[PDB]
Amino acid sequence: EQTYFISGANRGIGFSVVQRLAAKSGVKVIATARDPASATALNELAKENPQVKVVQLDISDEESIKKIAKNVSQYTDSIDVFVSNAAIAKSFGPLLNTPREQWIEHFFTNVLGPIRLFQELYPLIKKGTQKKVFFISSNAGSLNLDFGLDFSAFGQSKAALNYSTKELARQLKPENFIVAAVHPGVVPETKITPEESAAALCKLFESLNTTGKYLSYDGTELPW
């Protein structure tokens, strides 16, 4: 058996990933939503496949993250594959035109949120077998790619989390953790369906055997 944990599972790639794991035999899935009672798709998913466990998480709300270890501990003794998926993407374009609020929100939600989530869930991951850790990042997060676009707070936040992911990989290598930053695709770079992003992500999540990688969905490396 393997416990997978996915934040932001109510819709998007996160829902598509949970949908797909719900298929795989002997897979337990802790799936989070900000508002589980409005998570119509995902409550139905869990009712048909009750190995899918639904759980409250707002990654922008420290009081929500302060409860995530108990909330997950209701359903499991461990986590094999942690996925920080929940995230926002609200501000793009020039720096002179990006207000304080946008920088602050992208930091708390996209950088602090995941770091606090991993910190809270590290004890549970440490007791698991696979010790796999996936921050859903973005290719716009690279300090060494040029898309001919500005990503403002969005890009900054993905780069900030990339930096810390890189360090965390170094830091946990001794404990045989597999730590990766992963660009899931776009759902101009070719867009893919959420179910396509999910399928490639599930494959990467099972295939990846080395730490400190920055991966695109298809398994090819990106520059940091």
Ligand X SMILES: NC(=O)C1=CN([C@@H]2O[C@H](COP(=O)(O)OP(=O)(O)OC[C@H]3O[C@@H](n4cnc5c(N)ncnc54)[C@H](OP(=O)(O)O)[C@@H]3O)[C@@H](O)[C@H]2O)C=CC1
Ligand Y SMILES: O=C1C=C2C(=CCO[C@@H]2O)O1
Interaction of residue 144 with a copy of itself, rule CB under 8 A:
yes
Q: How far apart are CA 171 and CA 177, in angstroms?
A: 9
Contact call for residue 179 and ligand X (CB under 6 A): no
Residue 100 binds which entry of ligand X, ligand Y, a copy of itself, none, CB below 5-8 Å type-dependent: a copy of itself
**Does 10 belong to an annotated binding site?**
yes
Listing DSSP states for the chain in one string gives: -EEEEESS-SSHHHHHHHHHHHHSTTEEEEEEESSGGG-HHHHHHHHHSTTEEEEE--TT-HHHHTTHHHHHHTT-S--SEEEE--------S-STT--HHHHHHHIIIIIIHHHHHHHHHHHHHHHSSS-EEEEE--GGG-SS---SS--HHHHHHHHHHHHHHHHHHHHHGGGT-EEEEEE--B--PPB--HHHHHHHHHHHHHH--SSSEEEETTS-B---
C-beta closer to ligand Y: residue 75 or 103:
103
**216 interacts with a copy of itself by CB under 8 A:** no
Q: How far is the CB of 174 from ligand X (least distance, A)?
A: 27
The interface with a copy of itself within residues 31-70 (CB under 8 A) comprises: 62
Q: Which of 34, 67, 166, 203 binds ligand X (CB under 6 A)?
A: 34
Residue 13 and residue 30: Cα distance in Å, rounded? Answer: 15
Dist CA 123 CA 78 (whole Å) = 8
Interface residue with a copy of itself, options 104, 129, 206, 210 (CB under 8 A): 104
Tell me, by CB under 6 A, how many residues bind ligand X. 25
Residue appearing with tokens 């099972």:
206
- Compare residues 177 and 217 and give the one whose CB is closer to ligand X: 217
Instruction: Say which entry of ligand X, ligand Y, a copy of itself, none residue 105 contacts (CB below 5 to 8 A, set by partner kind).
Output: ligand Y
170 is in an annotated binding site: no
* Interaction site with ligand X (CB under 6 A): 8, 10-14, 34-35, 57-60, 85-89, 109, 136, 138, 183-184, 186-187, 194
Annotated binding site for NADPH: 8, 10-11, 13-14, 34, 58-60, 85, 87, 136-137, 158, 187
Q: Which residues bind a copy of itself (CB under 8 A)?
A: 62, 94-96, 98, 100, 103-104, 107, 111-112, 115-116, 118-119, 122, 141-144, 150-152, 155-157, 159-160, 162-164, 166-168, 170-171, 223-224
